[PDB]
Amino acid sequence: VTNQLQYLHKVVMKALWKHQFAWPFLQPVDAVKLGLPDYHKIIKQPMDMGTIKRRLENNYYWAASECMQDFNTMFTNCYIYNKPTDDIVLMAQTLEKIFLQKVASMPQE
Numbered sequence: 001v002t003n004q005l006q007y008l009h010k011v012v013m014k015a016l017w018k019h020q021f022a023w024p025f026l027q028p029v030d031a032v033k034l035g036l037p038d039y040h041k042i043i044k045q046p047m048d049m050g051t052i053k054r055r056l057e058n059n060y061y062w063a064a065s066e067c068m069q070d071f072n073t074m075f076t077n078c079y080i081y082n083k084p085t086d087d088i089v090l091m092a093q094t095l096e097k098i099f100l101q102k103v104a105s106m107p108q109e
Contacts, residue, residue, distance in 0.1 A: 001059060002063065002064060002109055003107050003109050004063070004064035004106055004107060004108075004109055005056065005061055005063075005064055005067060007064075007106045007107060008056060008064060008067050008068070008106070009056040009057075011102055011105075011106075012071075012099060012102045012103065012106075013049070013052065013053055013056060015098055015102060016049060016095055016098060016099060017049060017053065019094075019095060019098065021091035021094050021095055022049065022095065024088055024091060025048055025049045025074060025078075025091075025092075025095070026048065026049050026050055027048055027050050028046055028048045028050070028051065029043075029046055029048070029077075036081075039081065042080065042081050043077045043080065043081050045073055045077070046077065047070050047071075047073040047074040047077060048074060049074065051070075052067060052070050052071060052074070055067070055070070064106065068103065071096075071099055075092050075095070075096045075099075078092040079092065
């Protein structure tokens with residue numbers, strides 16, 4: 001635990017988890033369900049908010065920047081994999097703006 005990881009858990013994750021556009025990101029991408037047989041060929045480090053949440057709950061992270069990189073990977077995966085016109089891209093962008101706004105007020109340490 002750091003004060004920063006606390007803030008990521010209580011402020012950042014809280015605000016994104018309950019957001020109306022969060023639902024595609026709450027669990028790992030299931031490439032079979034979604035009919036995306038090339039997903040895991042393109043995206044080599046899958047990430048999702050449930051995994052990040054579990055990691056915060058279980059004190060997996062050593063530093064805030066580690067959890068921040070996982071959020072980033074999650075969004076980046078979406079931008080890389082999806083078509084520019086896919087609605088999921090706009091959902092991701094919306095959530096990432098919240099993430100950045102909240103991170104701008106995270107404490108030092």
